[PDB]
Design a protein around this nucleic acid. Sequence first.
DNA 1: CTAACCCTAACCCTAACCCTAACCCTAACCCTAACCCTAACCCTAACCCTAACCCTAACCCTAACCCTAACCCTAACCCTAACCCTAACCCTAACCCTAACCCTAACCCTAACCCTAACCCTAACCCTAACCCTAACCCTAACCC
DNA 2: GGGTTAGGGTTAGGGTTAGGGTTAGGGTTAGGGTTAGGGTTAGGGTTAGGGTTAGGGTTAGGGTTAGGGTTAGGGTTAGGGTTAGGGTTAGGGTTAGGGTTAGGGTTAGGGTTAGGGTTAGGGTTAGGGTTAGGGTTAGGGTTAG
Lengths: 109, 109, 83, 83, 100, 100, 99, 98
Amino acid sequence: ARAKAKTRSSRAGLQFPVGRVHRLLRKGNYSERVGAGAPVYLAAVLEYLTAEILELAGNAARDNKKTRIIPRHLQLAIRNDEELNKLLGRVTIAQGGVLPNIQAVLLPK
Amino acid sequence: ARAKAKTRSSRAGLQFPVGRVHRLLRKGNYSERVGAGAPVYLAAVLEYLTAEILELAGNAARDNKKTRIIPRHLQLAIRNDEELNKLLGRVTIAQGGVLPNIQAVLLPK
Amino acid sequence: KVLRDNIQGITKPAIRRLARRGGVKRISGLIYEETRGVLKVFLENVIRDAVTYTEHAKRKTVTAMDVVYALKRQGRTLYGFGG
Amino acid sequence: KVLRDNIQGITKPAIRRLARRGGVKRISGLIYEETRGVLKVFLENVIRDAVTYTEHAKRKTVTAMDVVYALKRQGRTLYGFGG
Amino acid sequence: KKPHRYRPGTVALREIRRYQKSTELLIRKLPFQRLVREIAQDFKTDLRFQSSAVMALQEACEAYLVGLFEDTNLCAIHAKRVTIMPKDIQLARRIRGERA
Amino acid sequence: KKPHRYRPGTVALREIRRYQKSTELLIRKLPFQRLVREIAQDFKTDLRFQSSAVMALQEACEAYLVGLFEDTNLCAIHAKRVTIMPKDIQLARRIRGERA
Amino acid sequence: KKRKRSRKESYSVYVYKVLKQVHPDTGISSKAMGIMNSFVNDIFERIAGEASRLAHYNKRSTITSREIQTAVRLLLPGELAKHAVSEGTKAVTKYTSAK
Amino acid sequence: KKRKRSRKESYSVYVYKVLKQVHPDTGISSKAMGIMNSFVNDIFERIAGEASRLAHYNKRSTITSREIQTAVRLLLPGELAKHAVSEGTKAVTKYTSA
DNA sequence: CTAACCCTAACCCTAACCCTAACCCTAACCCTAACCCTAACCCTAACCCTAACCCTAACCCTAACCCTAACCCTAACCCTAACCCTAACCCTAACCCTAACCCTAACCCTAACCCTAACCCTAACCCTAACCCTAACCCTAACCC
DNA sequence: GGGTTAGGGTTAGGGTTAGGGTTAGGGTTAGGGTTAGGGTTAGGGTTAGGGTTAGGGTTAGGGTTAGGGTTAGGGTTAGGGTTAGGGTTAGGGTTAGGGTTAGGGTTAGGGTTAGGGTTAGGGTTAGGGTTAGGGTTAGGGTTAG
């Protein structure tokens, strides 16, 4: 009996582990009972955010003429995107740096 | 026989409901299992904090020549003693006003 | 209402008394518009949060508990207007 | 274990480099002592929280996870070392 | 008769102590309630506010404005000046981390 | 004799442009390890540390110092001045926090 | 009148009996009562959340007096922390001596 | 020796797949992967905490979808919230249909 | 306004290590049977917001006078910036040892359901004393002379 | 220059709305059972941190000389402070209405749990590829005429 097992992710169309997201919510003591659409919803949100961040990082890396995504590109993309900067304001990325910006008064007279 | 019932608060000589603190820690879904000394410890800490705050409020009321404890006295006491303002810095008390403080530069000649 | 004088409801005196309570002796004439704009934005944020909470609660009335929970999100807790 | 020389370890040239990145042209002579003082004040609290976490963990080795958990309580979150 | 007339600053310093000693509100409730209604009209219609939400909003807004005015006065005194200017509020909001 | 002596400011702007592009550390590691080992002696004795711990400590300290120096530079430029003074850090370890 | 109603739970009587001990011949108002209730609830939530996080970080599933003391030391500032720790240890010792 | 180490888990296998769809030829580093893992874990715990607080405020005992949607609308800023809500509704509809 | 001169951006090799593939396998995600606690749904009743009509009242808006602080130009020198020469101190490998973190068993010891009363906490009622507003009576502050 | 003005405590004194004491009742905590699971002790092993030696190479301190920045001073002029006089607007009543929400009484869709059974990501090697290092080199900058 039984059937070829189909992973819950495949049934929905996502790329994040819905089973792992559900297990983390179960072993997190956030509530007594857990639903069935919440892990898929959170996995889709995480996948969208990761896709946007990786798109910005790849754009920054291509602008820097490199094939490796270093944390410098991540920091640049996060500090350039207004919504991502508002979402991650208290976050400090290691080996990132700051944006090159000099005040107009400090410029040569 | 069931025998007489000594309230748990009485055995420890406190004034906060240890039986209610345990029920709150059980229903709050903070953990799976709860100990026995944790509610007593938390009740003692809360009683100490409340006693200190009420002592400061009573001192402020005595200085204000009144018999009731108004939120003005609470605000004055919290803004005055060293370790109370640091604990409740982001706390805004309604009907508390501000602390009288005028800069020396704005004072007359 | 929907009148365009809604922001103008905060009068020039009101801001003067607020600044006197803050501790200002001399006030310029271009502080009022900035204060009104900051007040409107601060009200818009908290009202957005409260309306979101109310719609999530599936009700049509805005209670004080929703406003308290909205203010606790921004970091400024309010004590006493609600449990 | 020298008190003065361990703080004097952050030399004057290093403090200059930290200000050039922020965007400072001219620097006074009474900035380095206050910078070292603020650094000490921050490190004292961070190390206090880290040692408290280590003692609660019943261990004698401070870890990057404990450092991150101590930094996250104060507000700032670090992505990279640990996690 | 013509009064001695008060030198500039006396009335301000007298009102400062009066407004720092009191606890009552300085903003009228009726013009503020209509502003709250207009602001809430944008998010959803047919909304009904109670009698405590508007009061809590007014208290929080007055506290925030008092804090902002204190920061503005500090920034103005730092600039070797007495009066406050719109640049002081902008600098205070930039240092706080709200504007940018 | 002309030893290509640059005017005061050009070398400073050059160093600013240089250090605003690199991501390396600007603090020595051995005296910082000495400091973080000496400070921990007041809370307990005989503790042993790891490399990643002091690395994260140095990273966070450098980030906080960069932020504080940016705030101080803004406060100094607001005062119609180019150089930074100890009077600006205090109005900063205050409008923000950490107790001047 | 209708199908029953709702009873609400508040820490008033306790704050009043603590006030009678810390300062006899003194009254209090409902505003200060609600403020103290909100303060107690906030401290309760903070100490519960910190204890839960401390228990979850060490792969343990039981909140005990040690975790509560660690949370108090991490939350409270200086002298108040040690005072609360001592007053909690005294109560725990009394409870262990007589349950 | 013989291994005997607690097997640790992460999202490194899932992040790599997403990178390949968005940009076909680029590559990522271990430090960037660890930073992305911490970011994902932080967003996860934020969403979970907000949903738990909403469930405890509404006197409920289960975290269903509407709760996660409200948590997203409260946490995410502007159009990112709308896009995440749209994608989550699409995923939930597909999972319900299939 | 060029000379003279300096510091960067920009190619052509090398090579090293960190990234990208291919294996083995073990812990973990699915199906398929139970089951019941939780949530949805309709009816209803009390209430608490929502409108409108009143008055007068402290309140706000506009004008005039005029003392004042913000703003701009100028001069002094003292604090700070650029450059060279030491030599003391940071940086890198290898070796060595040992204390401390993590696996691996066995076991009490402390924690979790579950009836059962019963004393403690909450909702109403009645009361009265502490607080608030109304008028004289100084009372001390401004600020010219 | 010691007054005129002139806003602020000070005190009887009466009125009143809100804390304080008192009961009746539902309800929630503690007591005496059984049961099973997480927390503690006692071992072994193995691995990462601290203590030593060895250079030798980048770089900070200590000067020297100088030129751009700060503070004080003075003058000028708008832009705020202060005060009077009139009139819309805010605020406490009172009345009526009706939309709303917090319960009960069922009921079926959705929750958890366990036991096999298969599989996908985590723990190992290996190899080829990307960028850092080290020389030239044109060009844009900078100091000073």
